[PDB]
Enzyme design. Structure first.
Site, PDB file in Angstrom:
ATOM      1  N   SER A   8       4.034   2.506   8.271  1.00  0.00           N
ATOM      2  CA  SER A   8       3.670   1.493   7.339  1.00  0.00           C
ATOM      3  C   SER A   8       4.857   1.171   6.408  1.00  0.00           C
ATOM      4  O   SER A   8       5.782   1.816   5.967  1.00  0.00           O
ATOM      5  CB  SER A   8       2.574   2.063   6.235  1.00  0.00           C
ATOM      6  OG  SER A   8       1.417   2.333   6.908  1.00  0.00           O
ATOM      7  N   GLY A   9       5.020  -0.209   6.003  1.00  0.00           N
ATOM      8  CA  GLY A   9       6.255  -0.646   5.421  1.00  0.00           C
ATOM      9  C   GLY A   9       7.421  -1.194   6.317  1.00  0.00           C
ATOM     10  O   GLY A   9       8.391  -1.853   5.774  1.00  0.00           O
ATOM     11  N   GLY A  29       2.766   6.421   8.674  1.00  0.00           N
ATOM     12  CA  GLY A  29       4.275   6.775   8.435  1.00  0.00           C
ATOM     13  C   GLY A  29       4.987   5.327   8.715  1.00  0.00           C
ATOM     14  O   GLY A  29       6.307   5.700   8.332  1.00  0.00           O
ATOM     15  N   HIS A  61       0.809  -1.277   0.034  1.00  0.00           N
ATOM     16  CA  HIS A  61      -0.072   0.052   0.051  1.00  0.00           C
ATOM     17  C   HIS A  61       0.899   1.247   0.004  1.00  0.00           C
ATOM     18  O   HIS A  61       0.357   2.390  -0.259  1.00  0.00           O
ATOM     19  CB  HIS A  61      -1.071  -0.003   1.243  1.00  0.00           C
ATOM     20  CG  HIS A  61      -0.368   0.507   2.546  1.00  0.00           C
ATOM     21  ND1 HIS A  61      -0.156  -0.472   3.271  1.00  0.00           N
ATOM     22  CD2 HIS A  61      -0.258   1.463   3.245  1.00  0.00           C
ATOM     23  CE1 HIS A  61       0.526  -0.005   4.387  1.00  0.00           C
ATOM     24  NE2 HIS A  61       0.303   1.297   4.296  1.00  0.00           N
ATOM     25  N   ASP A 114      -0.009  -7.534   1.671  1.00  0.00           N
ATOM     26  CA  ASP A 114       0.650  -6.241   1.802  1.00  0.00           C
ATOM     27  C   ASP A 114       1.837  -5.998   1.832  1.00  0.00           C
ATOM     28  O   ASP A 114       2.694  -5.996   2.987  1.00  0.00           O
ATOM     29  CB  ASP A 114      -0.223  -5.400   2.742  1.00  0.00           C
ATOM     30  CG  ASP A 114       0.116  -3.981   2.743  1.00  0.00           C
ATOM     31  OD1 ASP A 114       0.516  -3.607   1.817  1.00  0.00           O
ATOM     32  OD2 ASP A 114      -0.375  -3.395   3.728  1.00  0.00           O
TER      33      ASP A 114
END
Ligand code: CA
Lengths: 4, 240
Positions: free
Chosen positions: B188-189, B186, B45, B93
């Site tokens: 995320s990942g 922020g 995402h 994801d």
């Protein structure tokens, strides 16, 4: 759901 | 990261800052994990937008020169083929970014250790989430890398009605949910580092939190379970  | 503490400069050398070009500057949007000198693992995402991305390794303070940063462009983006931007709860994801150049490894830039395929953490396992994400729900990004202790919540509990219910899948890892500490926009990942056999390994890729807020009781931060994608990751790297 809340992609962060 | 909500309810975190400032990380030491050399504690999480595989953490990277994924940034996009905004006007005449760059803006941090997500975290990621350096897994090869020229490959970064992040959330799918994070790269849904048709933006210009760059990866920063050896980063600590987003607003000040640390004298340890390396900046590299993203040459290719490989999102998991099953990823559906309209259904993050379905999973998948995860995305791999091939860097334009191979970064140099040192005390501040190291490859993240990934878990053995299929590995599942026992309930309440010790882990730390790290990132420059919001420090409060609807707040602002952290200037310096933050870390928060987030013990895992196993599938049985995380998928219960009181928690995430059917929203969480076995292809995910849940951690935290104490209402004080959590990942936030922020982050995320980025990585979820868990101590296993005396070694920290990246078991999760930060995926999502509650629409009600970041630090919500019984709504632990949800991560893509890295150990469920080892073959996919290896396949992508070997073919690119
Ligand atoms: Ca810096």
């Amino acid at each position: 759901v809340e992609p962060x | 990261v909500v309810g975190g503490t400032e990380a030491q400069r050399n504690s999480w050398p595989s953490q990277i800052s994924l940034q996009y070009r905004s006007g005449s500057s760059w803006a941090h949007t997500c975290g990621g994990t350096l897994i090869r000198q020229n490959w970064v693992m992040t959330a799918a995402h994070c790269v849904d937008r048709e933006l210009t991305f760059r990866v920063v390794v050896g980063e600590h303070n987003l607003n000040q020169n640390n004298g340890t940063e390396q900046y590299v462009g993203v040459q290719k983006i490989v999102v998991h083929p099953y990823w559906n931007t309209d259904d993050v709860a379905a999973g998948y994801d995860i995305a791999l970014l091939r860097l334009a150049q191979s970064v140099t490894l040192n005390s501040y830039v190291q490859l993240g250790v990934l878990p053995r395929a299929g590995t599942i953490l026992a309930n309440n396992s010790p882990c730390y989430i790290t990132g420059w994400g919001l420090t409060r729900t609807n707040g602002q990004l952290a200037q310096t890398l933050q870390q928060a202790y987030l013990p895992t919540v196993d599938y049985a509990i995380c998928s219960s009605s009181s928690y995430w219910g059917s929203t969480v899948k076995n292809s995910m890892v849940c951690a935290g949910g104490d209402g004080v500490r959590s990942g936030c926009q922020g982050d995320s990942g980025g990585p979820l580092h868990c101590l296993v056999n005396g070694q920290y390994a990246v078991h999760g890729v930060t995926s999502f939190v509650s629409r009600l807020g970041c630090n919500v009781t019984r709504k632990p931060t949800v991560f893509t379970r890295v150990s469920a994608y080892i073959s996919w990751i290896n396949n992508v790297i070997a073919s690119n």
